[PDB]
């Protein structure tokens, strides 16, 4: 029994736990957390920790990101970036952009852990996006080492002629829906932190599925689970809440009364259930359209008003209320019993119909804000006014809440906006409190564009194409990579080699 | 015990082996192998096989590539491609180029299996390059399914308005020096075949090391291990042999008589070994000068022209050269001695480095001797060059073709070259066709993928940092739309419709 | 250098040839119990222009041939969850199938190396990667042994081992790890890594076990088959139902679940089943002949209350059968008569449906049974039609036993423990691993190198 | 231009450098480094570093390991363990053993990163063994967490009925050769540190290749390359030097003077170079006999036929040793090293005890622990090996591989088996390990149980597995709790 020992002596267990809860409570008092709500205590967090404290460089980048985005919000400016594929691209973005985005969409088509690509359905294995974050972070880390060495090796007077690129640009990545239940969310979060992420975003859709939402309660839990995992690991990982309620058409359950005001119901008492009808149509293929119309689906508020045609007094009192207390309000104002069934128009998967929109999205963001360092509302157009509506809507309740914007390529920016305004779109939005903006898929498109250009030219005229469209433009622009050996770290590793010999 | 069974019943083992050995024999009679030397039997091969025979899509692509390269060589045309970084890129390449190249260099800086990058030393883990091959090949396969579906879902009258891309462009990949001994070479070759490589290339350098060479014997075994493993897995993998002898300055050992003509020696009988001196000094370029290093033949001829007499110096010299061409040092020594040439002082041990490497004077003639040595064990050959010299490229081809006239060649359109300062634009354009006439039937820009991606990224982010969203519309989205880039309607391109018709089929 | 991949003039004829081939395939005996809700034409539409053949298919064919002859004789193949290659080379001598456990994987083989209880929150690359691990090892030791046997003279061969290492593998696909697209991606991985058959549960991912409706778990079972078709393989699909012990269900939308959904019966407040008909059809039946509420006792998550048990599980197994090559119902205890009721309930509609059984280690086999009945338990269940049986966690438990046993003894008496507790018994049993170089393939690779030089 | 900035302002670069180089020199003075030669300067090391400082759990386990082995050696005791395979095993070992070993041999047969198995030639991808380290180490961190939670979730008055296992047992693993050049070594060392390793060992073999040695200078370089990598990430990683000299017959080159005493030469002036011969013919064993190969010092004695020679010639560079003879009036000795070279180019060598000791001594200043690969449980040889290195460096930790292949039932009486580890620990062998123990234990139960289960079914699971597991108090028999079910449902409840 020479090698048997306890792992923490029982005479110190209680006394170390105290010492640690005092450190966590004192950590939680830092202004980093002044907008953050934790429905758990330091005691429950520390009692899940083990005896070996791990420190992550993720944390340092979270902090770096937090400093950046606050000066961004306080000055009503914006950091903006785009969706990076791979280390060559990240080394060039670092010269001009202070954040890095890692897209799940680009990852679905370029970076799945199983190599099986496809559309953006978050059906890649969930190591995918974190593994891409590491791919970039380890390349950032490396080029930092390479450059530092080149600088410090030369005389101070001479360093003015050398490049001084900030490669350590903090990374924000897509956690999708969280890839499962709340045990998966914490595990996913754990990978993002182990792999270098400075912040992640998570969205209120259902996984495995118009878009289908989860109840607000389910998404809050997610946001808490992320925070619960960063606490425990001791890190300042930004968490970002995305709502897909603007164009969502379905919801999994009707159990959260915050969601009631938007759930659509059939107002036709003669109609049987849709699912009953669709199944018991046993003989047929490729009728749902008419059950829909003949059911005259409405929000309950609209259904109440339409019966009335008191209305105004109804809307004022009913705002935010469950279905039961909205019926009750109405019939207390002399309104007949309205027929409102929201089971009947359920899909054959069991899902509920919803009418989303900008109002449903403000509701969800405000619900999510105590648990989210930043928010965004996916939208169908790059319309500045809708953006101001949403932002004033959220800032009515929480005027310090940071916001984030997706400058999407799913938009046709020629037929959506004049050139003079494309130029001003980030600056204006920043004025509303969108301190972080990003183009999800630029990496994909830039790459597809020059590969199409060059492979064509190269096919037609050969090595003329490499000189004219690649190697000579590189020179004139001063792109470091044209001197590829020096860029790859050949001089850095040569000095390592000699230091050892 | 009614779950206990043999594997094959002992009464059928000898028979199954005879059938297989027959199949391998018939297979090796295919014209594919008409230039192929196999220093092993079919029985030896089959004895290494198991009871479950596996079939690889790699094989399909190797067969597809072989037929392509055969057509090019005979017409003296060329297939040319470049080093592909990623699936997005590979989907664009597939439109215009019939092959794909996967680079060790690009992989070292963008694709190590450990995510740790660095200069091209082949010190990434050896899963690195095959994993990139699976990366591209699995995307090629997907985009094939997507497009076959969209096409077949439309009626014949409407299919000509639809893209019809060959996404299955065969992949050629870097295997470096094989990453260790012959067993790793076999293990490496096995990963490549499992992940979809049509062909692989391997260099005559020494791993872990002014390039250092391995002896000809050692590199020939690499090339044989490859073939011995493709045989076994029953596939038709192309094995490309690359020699770095044109620029190399060093070699691991002096044991191969085919390298004895290029190995350098000291001709100064007074000097102490360079290693003994360097150790005792705890210069070096100083010892070298006083060492007066030379290939043995030149050392022998310089003795002939310094030795009155020897009354017939030009006739002794000439005769020695013709007789010693391709001979060991020992055999060369005897011949000169048989000719009345005084004993020559020649020490090739004394200039060894502190690592124990021998010096060597490479260059084109050494590269030629190496390629001729590798040729029967290689489906294609190349010689690394220091600049795009057409003439040296022609001297190298003619040297190989003097002995093996039908030996396919490969050329590296290196971006380590300065193409503005090597060649006018009009001659830039003809270069690949010129090289194709000499039988360089496969050509490739190794790092084009890295540089194209670097260039769009440096100029799009700069603009983006400058004029925001106008940059994206100016530089990216509008040009995509004008050029008709399929990726620009990116949901369709990713297969949004293919997967939708997949889940509707199931529900 | 620009070519089209399939000329337009050959597209239709090639599509035609291929649809005819799939139909001639589906007319094979292997598919005589199998319901496909889609056509060959649809399936080919989802294929590309390069056919890939998989070793998986040979193993699926081997497994079918195995279980057919076992079911026809009311016999049984039985195995256990294998952890790891050393173990699989030892199993291969006495057991003809191999099981790969999600439970064992969650605790020892997750792709992220982060362990935890069996909640299927590991990356879905986890279990198919464990199939490859064992399979790649199987194919090796097969090549090693074939060389040794064929290197020797037939006279001396009977004195050599002759193990079937290619023992067909069955693996846990849990719930599918997502919606149907993920199921097909997951199914695609197993077929590529070498699975002979996979199994999949009617639980809900992310979650008193909670159920999915019958229709959702049929789709899982069709997505699987549809991915095997397309890839051209004969993957065996095992449907598992956790109904005997389930208490919740995600939605009420399916009419086949109505017969078991528990409703409230105190009008005062804000539990019993109603009684194969729907509820609207059930009420209409009762008032064609002369109060029931299930939205109230919903959980805070929106789940419906339900009453499981053999009745609920016979309902579900009969729904899945046309879509499944084998059925099993996970039980709380190893109860013969319960196993007789289940088999009888299913065979009363599908006499021919193969069955599977979990000889659970979650059980207490000393308490629940005597040693004589222990020896016959498998044999008896085989009479019922359970043709494939397995101990999920035997691998985990054997490894933990000998490890605790040996690490302890080795800590007390050094190398005496290694000689006494390991080496000496290894030789008395004639364990091939004791000659470790040879076992590892040292002679195989040696001859490989010698053949190259 | 609102997003561009330099990463370190030029005005702070010189100051930050100076302060970090200050931290390294302070760090290098710790007692931990008192035996350690560093052929490079703090300035050279920090010049390779980046701007972002990274802390590794490896470091903590390095420091735990060192503190364990320091005590073992002063006390002339030993830590022992064996080659662990997988997390189920490591949670069981943790109860009774204080270190964990990760084997290349086991990993080649059970854990390659490509899933392609094979005999120990270190020809798997070099991600293989660091990946196994992580496999085990992430398992240790979880069970540590799970058990801390169980214990803290219980009143103090009740904890003594609960387990208290040290799952954070420091891991030592196999770096083989380094898997190539020195850049490969640093990259491989870099992985081990990122993945959890407390220590690693590396060998003087040539990769890709009787055994073939590298020259002494080359392996020293490997060691320095490990330590430099560790000194960049700022970790106390243990570096173990293994020599394979005692059974080695080949070496790659003769360029290193310290190897000269063991390289065999030809003593026959009548013979042509072996390779010259073998080639013309395309007989070796005949040549090897007729060449009469001896190490230089023996061919010199035979010529004399002396004591003053062997006294002066020890560890000298042949060109020196030859002149040593020339000074003592000794005729021209005919020795040729290059003749007996193999067809691959390798030199012949005669290893054995005196070679391993010579190499061990040359490695020690770069090695936190030394060991000589042994094929045989000979106590007397362990003594001679130890006493030799201890003549020069008496405080060198040593390590020892306990043979799994040898027949222990006959090698030694039972009682001497019981004492073997203790007897070696008295020589300085403070860390000891059976490499393949994990493989054999798994192979023993699997054969044993699979047969019984094929024969008597479920009876065999109760009789040979479930009942003994209960009677022994194996925490795994309650598998749900052991997996950490209670730890995770408490996690979830904390959230919701
Ligand atoms: Mg996404
Ligand atoms: Mg390379
Ligand atoms: Mg499971
Ligand atoms: Mg090893």
């Amino acid at each position: 029994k020479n090698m048997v020992n306890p792992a923490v002596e029982p005479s110190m267990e209680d006394d170390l736990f105290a010492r640690e809860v005092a450190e966590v409570k004192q950590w939680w008092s830092d202004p980093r957390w002044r907008y953050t709500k934790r429905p758990f205590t330091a005691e429950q967090i520390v009692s899940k920790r083990g005896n070996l404290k791990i420190e992550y460089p993720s944390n340092a980048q979270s902090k770096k990101l937090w400093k950046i985005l606050e000066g961004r919000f306080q000055k009503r400016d914006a950091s903006y970036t785009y969706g990076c594929l791979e280390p060559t691209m990240v080394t060039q973005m670092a010269k001009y952009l202070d954040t890095v985005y890692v897209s799940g969409w680009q990852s679905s088509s370029t970076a799945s852990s199983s190599d099986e690509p496809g559309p953006d359905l978050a059906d890649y294995p969930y190591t995918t996006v974190p593994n891409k974050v590491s791919h970039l972070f380890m390349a950032q880390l490396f080029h930092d080492r390479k450059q530092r060495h080149e600088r410090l090796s030369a005389p101070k007077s001479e360093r003015s002629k050398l490049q001084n690129i900030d490669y350590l640009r903090p990374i924000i990545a897509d956690a999708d829906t969280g890839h499962g239940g709340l045990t998966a969310v914490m595990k996913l979060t754990k990978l993002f932190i182990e792999k270098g992420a400075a912040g992640i975003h998570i969205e209120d859709q259902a996984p495995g599925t118009g878009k289908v939402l989860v109840p607000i309660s389910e998404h809050i839990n997610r946001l808490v689970a992320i925070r619960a995992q960063a606490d425990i690991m001791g890190v300042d990982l930004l968490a970002i809440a995305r709502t897909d309620a603007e164009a969502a058409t379905l919801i999994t359950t009707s159990i959260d009364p915050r969601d009631h005001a938007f759930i659509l119901g059939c107002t036709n008492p003669s109609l049987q259930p849709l699912a009953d009808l669709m199944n018991t149509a046993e003989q047929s293929g490729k009728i749902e359209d008419e059950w829909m119309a003949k059911a005259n689906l409405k929000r309950f508020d609209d259904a109440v008003v339409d019966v009335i045609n008191v209305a105004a007094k109804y809307l004022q009192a009913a705002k935010g209320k469950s279905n039961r207390e909205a019926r009750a309000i109405a019939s207390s104002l002399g309104v007949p019993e309205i027929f409102f069934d929201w089971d009947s128009p359920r899909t054959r998967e069991g899902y509920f119909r919803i009418k989303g929109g900008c109002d449903c999205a403000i509701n969800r963001a405000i619900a999510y804000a105590p648990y989210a360092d930043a928010i965004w509302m996916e939208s169908k157009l790059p319309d500045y006014e809708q953006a101001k509506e949403f932002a004033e809507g959220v800032h009515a309740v929480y005027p310090e809440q940071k916001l984030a914007y997706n400058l999407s390529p799913s938009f046709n920016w020629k037929t959506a906006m004049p050139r003079d305004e494309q130029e001003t779109y980030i600056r204006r939005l920043a004025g509303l409190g969108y301190c972080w903006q990003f183009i999800t898929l630029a990496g994909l498109h830039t790459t597809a564009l020059i590969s199409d250009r060059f492979a064509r030219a190269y096919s037609e005229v050969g090595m003329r194409a490499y000189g004219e469209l690649v190697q000579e433009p590189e020179m004139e622009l001063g792109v470091d990579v044209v001197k590829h050996q020096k860029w790859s770290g050949a001089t850095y590793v040569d000095e390592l080699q000699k230091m050892v010999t």
Side-chain angles (χ1 to χ4, degrees), chain A residues 3-278 281 283-285 287-293 295-305 307-312 314-315 317-323 326-336 339-347 349-376 379 381-387 390-411 413 415-418 420 422-425 428-482 484-497 499-501:
Chain A
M3 299 171 280
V4 309
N5 70 277
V8 184
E9 280 287 316
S11 85
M12 287 166 63
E13 281 184 305
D14 273 345
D15 184 64
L16 283 172
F17 178 84
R19 225 165 290 273
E20 215 172 333
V21 183
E23 288 173 353
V24 172
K25 288 182 172 183
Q26 155 85 349
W27 171 43
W28 284 0
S29 83
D30 182 282
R32 162 68 176 103
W33 310 119
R34 64 190 195 252
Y35 310 116
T36 297
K37 175 179 186 177
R38 286 174 161 96
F40 50 81
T41 178
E43 284 80 18
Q44 301 167 286
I45 281 302
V46 174
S47 81
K48 308 300 183 307
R49 284 184 181 179
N51 299 293
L52 183 52
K53 193 226 320 165
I54 310 188
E55 299 211 88
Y56 306 93
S58 166
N59 188 32
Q61 301 301 83
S62 318
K63 294 179 181 191
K64 188 187 195 180
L65 182 65
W66 175 254
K67 172 164 175 189
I68 291 175
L69 282 185
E70 284 230 290
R72 246 42 171 191
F73 192 75
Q74 292 163 335
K75 298 183 197 66
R76 295 292 150 130
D77 299 327
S79 290
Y80 52 105
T81 173
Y82 66 87
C84 182
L85 294 178
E86 152 282 347
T88 315
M89 181 175 298
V90 120
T91 57
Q92 306 300 300
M93 299 167 51
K95 332 184 191 174
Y96 311 108
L97 317 169
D98 66 26
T99 53
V100 172
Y101 181 61
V102 175
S103 162
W105 200 111
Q106 289 187 156
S107 294
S108 198
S109 279
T110 78
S112 171
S113 295
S114 65
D115 277 335
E116 184 69 10
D120 188 22
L121 291 191
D123 67 354
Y124 45 66
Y126 73 75
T127 45
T128 299
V129 175
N131 280 354
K132 177 52 77 183
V133 173
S134 181
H135 192 201
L136 305 184
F137 191 48
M138 300 282 285
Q140 299 185 300
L141 282 183
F142 169 79
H143 286 264
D144 182 56
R145 262 148 47 215
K146 173 203 65 179
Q147 182 173 258
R148 190 165 184 264
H149 165 250
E150 182 201 23
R151 294 191 71 83
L152 294 180
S153 289
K156 172 186 235 304
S157 53
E158 270 232 348
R159 315 210 232 270
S160 52
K161 273 321 265 185
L162 306 172
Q163 276 195 325
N164 204 346
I165 291 175
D166 188 9
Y167 288 114
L168 298 182
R169 311 301 204 168
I171 301 175
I172 303 187
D174 182 341
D176 306 289
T177 263
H179 292 272
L182 307 174
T183 47
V185 179
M186 307 208 289
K187 282 182 142 183
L188 184 58
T189 300
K190 192 171 186 286
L191 285 179
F192 278 120
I193 292 156
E194 288 166 337
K195 303 276 193 170
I200 63 179
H201 66 77
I202 201 169
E203 59 180 26
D204 58 351
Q205 300 185 222
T209 77
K211 296 180 280 179
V212 179
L213 300 186
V214 290
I216 298 189
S217 181
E218 189 159 354
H219 193 65
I220 294 195
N221 285 343
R222 299 181 175 162
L223 292 164
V224 173
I226 293 180
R227 186 50 60 205
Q229 187 61 58
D231 299 329
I232 297 187
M233 304 179 80
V235 292
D236 292 351
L237 183 80
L238 275 72
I240 293 169
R242 145 163 175 187
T243 179
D244 277 294
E246 197 271 352
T249 60
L250 300 171
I251 190 158
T252 44
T253 173
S254 49
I255 205 70
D256 195 293
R258 294 173 281 206
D259 287 320
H260 282 170
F262 308 93
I263 310 184
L264 310 163
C266 155
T267 57
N268 191 323
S270 47
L271 280 180
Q272 58 163 347
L274 177 70
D276 282 70
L277 167 64
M278 228 59 206
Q283 358 308 322
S284 201
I287 166 178
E288 170 163 308
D289 276 19
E290 243 187 15
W291 190 99
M292 290 282 101
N296 195 5
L297 298 169
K298 311 181 193 184
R299 291 181 185 191
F300 184 78
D301 275 358
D302 295 321
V304 163
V305 172
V307 168
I308 296 173
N309 306 328
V310 198
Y314 174 68
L315 299 179
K319 217 147 50 172
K321 309 288 180 169
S322 60
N323 181 246
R327 293 197 188 261
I329 279 169
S331 72
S332 77
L333 300 172
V335 175
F339 189 89
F340 199 77
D341 186 336
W342 58 102
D343 288 350
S344 43
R346 279 179 308 159
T347 80
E349 293 94 25
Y351 304 149
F352 293 76
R353 310 275 172 187
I354 254 190
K355 176 177 180 174
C358 186
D359 45 15
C360 189
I362 300 180
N363 185 32
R364 259 142 193 281
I366 297 176
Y368 303 163
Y371 315 102
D373 300 310
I375 314 162
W376 58 284
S379 56
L381 276 185
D383 166 49
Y384 174 73
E385 296 299 327
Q386 196 193 63
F390 178 86
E392 293 172 345
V394 175
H395 291 135
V397 193
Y398 303 106
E400 313 267 78
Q401 180 64 79
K402 296 172 174 77
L403 305 175
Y405 197 85
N406 177 25
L407 302 154
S408 186
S410 300
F411 305 163
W413 293 76
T415 61
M417 195 173 318
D420 327 283
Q422 308 186 331
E423 188 164 342
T424 64
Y425 198 60
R428 313 187 238 130
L429 288 194
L432 303 178
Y434 293 101
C435 53
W436 195 60
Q437 306 178 20
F438 56 90
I439 312 180
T440 48
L441 313 185
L444 180 88
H445 286 289
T446 49
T447 296
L449 171 53
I450 202 155
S451 311
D452 191 55
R453 270 202 159 109
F454 177 71
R456 184 156 227 152
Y458 179 54
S459 72
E460 289 159 333
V461 301
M463 291 314 293
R464 190 146 82 95
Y466 189 71
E468 187 172 341
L469 283 67
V470 193
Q471 181 175 55
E472 288 322 302
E474 265 179 304
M475 294 282 176
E476 313 170 355
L477 299 203
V479 183
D480 47 349
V481 195
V482 72
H484 49 247
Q485 304 287 0
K486 187 200 167 193
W487 172 85
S488 59
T491 287
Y492 172 63
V493 166
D494 199 31
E495 286 308 310
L496 275 178
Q497 242 283 330
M499 177 186 72
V500 173
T501 58

